[PDB]
Amino acid sequence: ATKVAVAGASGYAGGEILRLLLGHPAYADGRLRIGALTAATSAGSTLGEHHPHLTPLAHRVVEPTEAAVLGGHDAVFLALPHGHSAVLAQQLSPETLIIDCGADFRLTDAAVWERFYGSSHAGSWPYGLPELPGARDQLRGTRRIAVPGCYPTAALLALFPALAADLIEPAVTVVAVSGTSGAGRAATTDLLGAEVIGSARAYNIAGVHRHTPEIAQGLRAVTDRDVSVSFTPVLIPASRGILATCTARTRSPLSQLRAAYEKAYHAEPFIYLMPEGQLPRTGAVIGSNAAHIAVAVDEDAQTFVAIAAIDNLVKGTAGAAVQSMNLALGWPETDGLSVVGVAP
Amino acid sequence: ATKVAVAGASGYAGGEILRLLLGHPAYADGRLRIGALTAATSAGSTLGEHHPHLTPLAHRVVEPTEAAVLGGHDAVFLALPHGHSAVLAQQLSPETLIIDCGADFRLTDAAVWERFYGSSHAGSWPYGLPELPGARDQLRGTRRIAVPGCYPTAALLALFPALAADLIEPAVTVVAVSGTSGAGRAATTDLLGAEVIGSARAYNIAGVHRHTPEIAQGLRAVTDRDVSVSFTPVLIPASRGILATCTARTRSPLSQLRAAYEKAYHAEPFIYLMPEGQLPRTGAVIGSNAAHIAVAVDEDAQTFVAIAAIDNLVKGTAGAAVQSMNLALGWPETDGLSVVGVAP
Amino acid sequence: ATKVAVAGASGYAGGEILRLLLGHPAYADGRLRIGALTAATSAGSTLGEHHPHLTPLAHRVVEPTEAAVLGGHDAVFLALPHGHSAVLAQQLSPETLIIDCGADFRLTDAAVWERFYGSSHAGSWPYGLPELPGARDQLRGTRRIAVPGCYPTAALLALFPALAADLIEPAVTVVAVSGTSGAGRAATTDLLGAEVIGSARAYNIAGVHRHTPEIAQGLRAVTDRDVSVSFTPVLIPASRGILATCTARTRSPLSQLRAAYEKAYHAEPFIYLMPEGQLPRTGAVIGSNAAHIAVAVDEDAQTFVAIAAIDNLVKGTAGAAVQSMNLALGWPETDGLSVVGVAP
Amino acid sequence: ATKVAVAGASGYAGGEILRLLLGHPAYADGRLRIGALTAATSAGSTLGEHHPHLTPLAHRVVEPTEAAVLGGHDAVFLALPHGHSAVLAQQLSPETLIIDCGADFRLTDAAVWERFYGSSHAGSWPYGLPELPGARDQLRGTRRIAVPGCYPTAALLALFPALAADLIEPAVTVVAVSGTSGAGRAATTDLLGAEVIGSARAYNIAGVHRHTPEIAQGLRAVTDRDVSVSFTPVLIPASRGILATCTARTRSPLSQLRAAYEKAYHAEPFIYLMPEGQLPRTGAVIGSNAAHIAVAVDEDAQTFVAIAAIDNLVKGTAGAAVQSMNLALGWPETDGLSVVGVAP
Ligand SMILES: COc1ccc2oc(C(=O)O)nc2c1
């Protein structure tokens, strides 16, 4: 009865929305209808030209991207770059579920948006990260979703408990490796297979990366102290995956950092704490909506280290969208989002 | 009802079988229960120490592979080296469904089997290739199953429908590239990551790879003529996937061959014919039970060319295992096996 | 005192030429200066913005590709392995040593050329593959070089000693895996890292690959029969590397065939026969101008199998180019060319 | 004429010394000669069996690792599987140049050594990082040399100059990604291509890594305050390369920090300072002995960021090893070591 359209369907995100939408129970029983699949430039093509893993929808024809095609859908995924979701949302009937993978609606501070993105703040919508305290309540039956960035999802999951229990200091370093699908499907020379194979490199360093404020915005959402974030992302030879290594100055004990995480997550179905003597690997969460997380303390340096492993495309993008979609239409949150990753 | 056991749950196959069983719809509604996860290798530990993606079963403990342990199971998965499924099939009730991922019960010729293994021939169970014509009816209600080798699964899918209608000569050549995951978890020096990264090498050439006669066996089943197969495997920097390039001297028009395949596979839900001038790619099938297949004709060389992409671990082993038992138990055969790959 | 210019310096073939020139003995003593570096687009930027691995040259500003800029150089390299260089070559003084990496001057049949390239045939220079019979002689002193394609160099190297001795039939099959760098540096979607990592796809199949007639061409110079080439190329997750699997039916015994290959190759310094029971791998030759070669007989298939492994940018391109530059300036053939690869 | 021996030649470390030795200019003129090749578990096999990339020495036989096999050599490179070569070192003539790629003779603090390794402190020989203040002198004419770890080489090359001019706090964080050739050649189930490919994982975190102290020790040698090291190593899908992300609270403008680096390094030919707007990548330095460094300041977070790239098997092992052995014998430091990488 609920028909959904996808803007950006030819992208990596839109291909991952459509993969999950195809595995959904409400798509098996026909509750959910895959409607119009639109793209910016390849309007006229079949889906199987872009996404040959989506063979069920291979025949589909990709449509232009305007409200003339997105009307009369109940949900609408925008897997768009920024600046487009803002104008496009305003064009759709305010009763339709807009779920935005773009950044346009993530930020609460307008002057912060302006410094990192260079367009005008559209405004804030419910953040698509159910585990974040106070977010699940906000998304229940909501008709707007701003899905998080991939890196902030890894960083908040790794760091927020220990800072929410005031067991670490509100200055955190984050260094996260990520696979090449976070860069997008836009072809450049830095994303050529020959350039990324057999090479790592960090980029947009020393605070300029746009996720930096997102990490701090979500860290400020469980603390009263000023929050400082040094963010460094590294590109590695992998197609999916994000290993976030999170550090902060601490003084509290391990048994208290530990016990605070399993209280935060012992009921969270998608967040998994590694058994003692295990560390997360991106490999283990790939294709799933899970996050493998380990905590430890560096004593000779008085530092808390949290490590976190998500899939940039699932829990960092599309999974988060469908998860928070489920809460938006009252369906079971884990409707269609497995915790078993495809390995090796 | 229907209790399930897995012998050799330590290795790549066991985990993959467990991964499928966890998504099987009979596991949701209870008609299937995951029981003894047995293993000679490291009996005593938790699964998670070996399969950190199967976290619903990370707590389970690896009992050793014993007749006593598999006893009292309505179904026993056997993903171990050759020779031990001959031993253990003899130690279990002839009514228990035995699905063997090993080699023992595949070759219905006896001098051939001793020829390339040095064993002595255990016997012959129905070939778990529900798309080999006739094989579907020999598994509808069976209790003994031998699932195929990964490369044969791909060659015979690429080659049979054209040899079946004798549009090709029975002298076939097949060079197939595969990931490191079909070589097993037995840590050897040449399977190391540093060596297999950035490297492709041929191995077990000049028809001495024990998948050579298994391709033969499948192929005589569709020709009265004299088959001779030149098989070369090549290993490439990937973990899952098989791309099989299969060519043969031909003289029939492309149209005659094209339509033969559309006939053999139009109502095959797992076998997908690439649209005209599209080509299989392993990344599109990985994590899926799909075979992606394309054919053309080399006129100047008067060769038929067939390309077949399977996920080596799903459709080439575990997914076929699961597929056969679906037919064994009179459950729909598409249950718990998807055609949507995980890509990129 | 030889001045050298490279047209196409911002790409892979050009960059690898420069890399071999910087470690050349003639460059170390002033006998070879590195003149102009040109490319179509991106003039005025620095070479380090394209090849940060070539830090000795990183300061060099890239100039426009005109026959002017290229003038006043004793040797000019045309780094266009996928481009068309015939125009320029006939606008430069004919006293210049011209090394064309592209295909324009490879083929000695205008008809074959128009069919596979859709353009007017521009002629036929000495094939820069010194190892093939009577190839090294036409090169000694030559001021015009046609550099062979990566795939062609491999297949030819593994099959010709045996066609030449009439110890195999002239109907050869060649299936070659290659890293993504042979696809050049043009930013196309299907060459992004996300796409090529974890996948393998055959491309341009059924003899529609412009390298098919080149292998036929080079093979025909060693026999009298026509030669029928079934050539299949596959892309694998690697940046460099070519491992060609070459089959052909025979009734020769192996010891005769190995005899052929030792005779063809005992005094060839860039060509290494694998000891009995060893097979080449691509990682073993990356960086080196070497080729690694094995040969076997599938007897139950009456087939002869050869494996060749070379680097697609060294022996398949810049190494051959430089190896034929040494023969063209009367310098030692191995000057600048290592036989030791950079593994792992 | 210096006869050189290599203990543990069949490992990644050893293979990389012999490769560098073959390109050394004193191995062409004959002042250097490759003597014994000791191999613990494979005496009696052919080196080619272990290092198919080293074909000039494929024929050599691997001998048992014994002091008589080595004696009678002017130089002995020690590269044991887990170092711990103090025992064997003691069995050698004091006349001999001993270059230890292990850890036993690295650390100058015997209690530190005991705590991290759990063993006798055997002492400390000159550290093979000629670029460190006052270390190059300790190296001219030495006959003992302790090769530094791959990780400390990069962390100390990214951090020493800031600390040396007192421009950062002495509390430093290091997150370093690395290829699997830094973890040795010992066949283990988590070092398999199927496990590494597709995955990143941090290991031995939060002070547990035996290179945390090494980084701490080299940093102390340049400032008068005391230093803490948060060190986190991350394994990524690559055979070679380390990308070190280094941070510390900042005391200064960036102009002060860049000056500190251009002064410290401008006369170091293996250290390359990235230009305006560029950042280092591991793929630029592969197989060269260069390190590429860039530095920046994150003003919002009051954090300095250094990024360093080196080939772990070259500048973190065999290159430092041969670069030291050049100074041990008064040869030019740069002999046999290029600053040009094998990209892509
Ligand atoms: C992570 O959030 C996004 C948002 C837009 C995107 O677009 C693409 C693309 O590949 O075209 N990937 C995307 C990811």
Residue numbers in the entry:
A (entry chain C), B (entry chain D), C (entry chain A), D (entry chain B): 9 to 352
How does the study describe this entry?
The L-arginine biosynthesis pathway consists of eight enzymes that catalyse the conversion of L-glutamate to L-arginine, appears to be attractive target for anti-Tuberculosis (TB) drug discovery. The arginine biosynthesis pathway consists of eight different enzymes ([Fig fig1]) all considered to be essential for *M. tuberculosis* growth *in vitro*. In this work, the ligandability of four enzymes of the pathway ArgB, ArgC, ArgD and ArgF is explored using a fragment-based approach. In conclusion, using a fragment-based approach, we have discovered inhibitors that bind to novel sites in ArgB and ArgF and to the active sites of ArgC and ArgD, which in case of ArgB show on target activity against *M. tuberculosis*.
Additionally, structures were solved with 4 fragment binders, occupying either of the two distinct pockets: the substrate-binding ([Fig fig2] and [Fig fig2]) and the NADP(H)-binding pockets ([Fig fig2] and [Fig fig2]). 2 mM NMR401 inhibited ArgC activity by 10% whereas 2 mM NMR863 caused a 12% inhibition. Although the thermal shifts obtained for NADP(H)-binding pocket fragments NMR401 and NMR863 were higher than those for substrate-binding pocket fragments NMR322 and NMR571, the SPR binding response for the latter was better and positively correlated with percentage inhibition of enzymatic activity (**[Table tbl2]**). Our results further show that in the case of ArgC there are two possible strategies to develop inhibitors, with one targeting the cofactor binding site and the other the substrate binding site. It is not clear at this point which strategy has the highest potential to result in potent inhibitors.
